[PDB]
Design an enzyme around this catalytic site. Structure first.
Site, PDB file in Angstrom:
ATOM      1  CG  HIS A  13     -33.760  56.028  43.168  1.00 22.41           C
ATOM      2  ND1 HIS A  13     -32.413  56.122  43.455  1.00 22.41           N
ATOM      3  CD2 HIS A  13     -34.305  57.205  43.561  1.00 22.41           C
ATOM      4  CE1 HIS A  13     -32.156  57.298  43.999  1.00 22.41           C
ATOM      5  NE2 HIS A  13     -33.286  57.977  44.070  1.00 22.41           N
ATOM      6  CG  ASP A 106     -29.933  54.463  41.846  1.00 22.73           C
ATOM      7  OD1 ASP A 106     -29.243  55.514  41.861  1.00 22.73           O
ATOM      8  OD2 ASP A 106     -30.981  54.325  42.509  1.00 22.73           O
TER       9      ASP A 106
END
Ligand code: UDP
Length: 451
Positions: A13, A106
């Site tokens: 990520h 995120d």
């Protein structure tokens, strides 16, 4: 001024979010990586063009997630101390002449959204999974689709031109096709989309030519803009950022070298092997994997992590010396771009897949969970750039199947198709991120909007 908040210690990520930040910097914005004090204290900072800024998950002196093994119970702790510390940071920075123009976050961290909106800081969700998996989670959150998701649910989507492929039982995302096995991951995956319609921007790390039906649907349904593949510019043959040639925030150290060993190997002969940075293999599974590699007869570069290599026997490790090399980490993009590399036996995490695509390397897919099964199905059918390992009735990967899939991609009748298709997608990927391409445009719009 631009804040970047990847799920901390998640390499899959952090890498694309940071690459996206480099493009922002290219357009004159100033990016800041926001991560935990622990991670910041064990990982050297990315460097120019990035500032760093620390929040807390509560455990500032110890890996919070080994200390707190249950998935559900890490998130709550992170949410508690994180949301607190995040809000601190906003006011600090604002009261320092450096307010946040937008928080790129995120969406596995929905509390980021809350803390930001409360400060009136613009928000942009950063989805680092393929559109095809995203929209499925999306349709669940929107209660347009009923848990558990089934192959018939999926076939409807395909019939309506939203999914470009027909998902079978082993192709639908496990986290919502069998929520029982992973209840925490299930809700986390669905939560992503709750409050998303309320974000200033939604961003997905993909490109439209890769998932044209799914990206069309994500844009029209969630305003999601494709901004990928979000990899270093060099591998996209994009010269605008000359020095953008490697991810700058590795959460794993490369002890053993592999590049000089790779030089000695013959062209298109090496199998890269990796199941990523999150998944774990038990002893028996490593044995099937390793013997499958040895039996294949090909040279192979096998990534067995530091925190995994204890499950590797001495006997198997010696058996691999004949034609292989085992390392705890490798410069995976650099490897994938190497002349010696012939295919990639991969768990098909999304970054690994996009990295194979951008280098035209065919895949042997051995997925475990999350988005990997769906990605694997795409690799196998629509993209035609490789094959997926078949598991037997007990769910076990056998060494015979490992050797079979390797020989099939390297030596089979379809070997030139897998390569041709990979090269075909490689060119579209590079095109979309180069000046004027479809992802490049979405990135320029985003940057224009906050400058
Ligand atoms: O030896 C390695 C293995 C991993 N990677 C990087 O780690 C990321 C793994 O992300 P992915 O989504 O493919 O899998 P995950 O680890 O998140 O499950 C990719 O960018 C890889 O290039 C790397 O640099 N060296």
């Amino acid at each position: 001024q631009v804040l970047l908040l990847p799920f901390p210690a998640a390499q899959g990520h952090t890498n694309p979010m940071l690459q996206f930040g480099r493009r922002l910097a290219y357009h004159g914005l100033r990016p800041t990586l926001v991560t935990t004090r622990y991670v910041l204290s064990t990982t050297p900072p990315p460097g120019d063009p990035f500032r760093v800024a620390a929040i807390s998950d509560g455990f500032d002196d110890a890996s919070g997630m080994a200390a707190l093994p249950d998935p559900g119970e890490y998130l709550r702790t992170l949410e508690a101390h994180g949301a607190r510390t995040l809000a601190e940071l906003l006011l600090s920075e604002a009261r320092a002449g450096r307010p946040a123009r937008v928080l790129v976050y995120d969406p596995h961290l929905p509390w980021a959204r809350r803390v930001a909106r409360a400060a009136g800081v613009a928000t942009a969700a950063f989805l680092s999974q393929p559109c095809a998996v995203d929209l499925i989670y999306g349709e669940v959150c929107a209660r347009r689709l009923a848990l558990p998701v089934t192959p018939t649910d999926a076939r409807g989507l395909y019939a309506r031109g939203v999914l470009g492929v027909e998902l079978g039982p082993d192709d639908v995302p496990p986290f919502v096709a069998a929520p029982e096995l992973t209840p925490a991951f299930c809700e986390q995956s669905i939560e992503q989309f709750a409050g998303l319609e309320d974000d200033d921007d939604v961003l997905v790390n993909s490109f439209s030519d890769l998932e044209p039906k799914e990206a069309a649907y994500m844009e029209s349904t969630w305003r999601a803009k494709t901004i990928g593949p979000s990899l270093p510019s060099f591998y996209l043959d994009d010269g605008r950022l000359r020095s953008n040639t490697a991810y700058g925030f590795n959460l794993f150290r490369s002890t053993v070298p592999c590049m000089e060993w790779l030089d000695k190997q013959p062209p298109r002969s090496v199998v890269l092997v990796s199941y990523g940075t999150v998944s774990t293999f038990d002893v028996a599974k490593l044995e099937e994997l390793g013997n499958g590699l040895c039996n294949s007869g090909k040279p192979f570069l096998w990534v067995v992590r530091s925190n995994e290599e204890h499950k590797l026997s001495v006997q198997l490790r010696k058996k691999c010396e004949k034609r292989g090399l085992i390392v705890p980490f490798c410069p995976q993009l650099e490897v994938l771009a190497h002349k010696a590399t012939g295919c990639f036996l991969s768990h098909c995490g999304w970054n690994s897949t996009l990295e194979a695509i951008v280098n035209g390397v065919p895949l042997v897919a051995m997925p475990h969970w999350a988005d990997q099964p769906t990605i694997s199905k795409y690799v196998e059918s629509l993209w035609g750039m490789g094959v997926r390992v078949q598991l037997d009735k007990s769910g076990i990967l056998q060494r015979e199947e490992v050797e079979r899939c390797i020989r099939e991609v390297m030596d089979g009748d379809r070997k030139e198709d897998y390569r041709r298709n990979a090269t075909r997608l490689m060119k579209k990927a590079k095109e979309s991120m180069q000046e004027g391409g479809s992802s490049d445009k979405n990135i320029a719009e985003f940057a224009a909007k906050y400058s």
